[PDB]
Amino acid sequence: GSNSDADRAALQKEVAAQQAELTRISDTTTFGGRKLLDGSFGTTSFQVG
Amino acid sequence: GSNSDADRAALQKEVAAQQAELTRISDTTTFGGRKLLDGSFGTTSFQVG
Predict the structure, then answer these.
(1) Residues in chain B whose C lies over 2.5 Å from the next residue's N (breaks after)
(2) Which region holds residue B20: left if phi is over 0, alpha if psi is between -120 and 50, else beta?
(3) Are the C-beta atoms of residues A28 and A35 closer than 8 Å to each other?
(4) Which of A15, A35, A45, B5 is deepest in the core (most CB within 10 A)?
(5) Do A32 and B4 touch (CB under 8 A)?
(6) Are the C-beta atoms of residues A26 and A41 closer than 8 Å to each other?
(7) Which residue of A has its CA nearest to B3?
(8) CB-based contact B1:A41 (threshold 8 Å)
(9) Which three-class secondary structure string do you get for chain B?
(10) SS3 of A19, please?
């Protein structure tokens, strides 16, 4: 309501913790010590023939 | 997967051992101390007439 919740400090802290959690989900997906979604993914290609 | 198995070092060791076993199969065919495939084979001709 632009004037009701003066708790904007903890609100920004909440969304900042959520962004940090997102950055963590980016990492910790190391299927082979080669974390998939984040970092530098080599744009691989699986040979099937 | 072009990036999934970082154990390509042991993979190379495996392939090199397979190649060395191939070269050993080439040797050790000393049918008379005249190993057929490698070593010294004169590419001779068997007389039958």
Answers:
(1) none
(2) alpha
(3) yes
(4) A35
(5) yes
(6) no
(7) A44
(8) no
(9) CCCCCCCHHHHHHHHHHHHHHHHHHHCCCCCCCCCCCCCCCCCCCCCCC
(10) helix
Q: Give the method used.
A: cryo-EM
Residue A12 corresponds to which tokens in the numbers above? 């920004």
The first and second tokens of residue A42, run together, are 């080599």
Return the structure tokens found at B8.
Answer: 């390509």
**Rounded Cα distance, B28 and B33, in Å:** 9
Paired tokens of B25: 């199969």
Resolution (A): 4.2
Which residue reads 């299927």 in tokens? A31
**Chain A residue with minimal CA distance to B5?**
A32
Chain A residues close to B1, C-beta within 8 Å: 44, 46
Matching residue, tokens 């001709």: B45
Residues of B in contact with A33 (CB under 8 A): 6
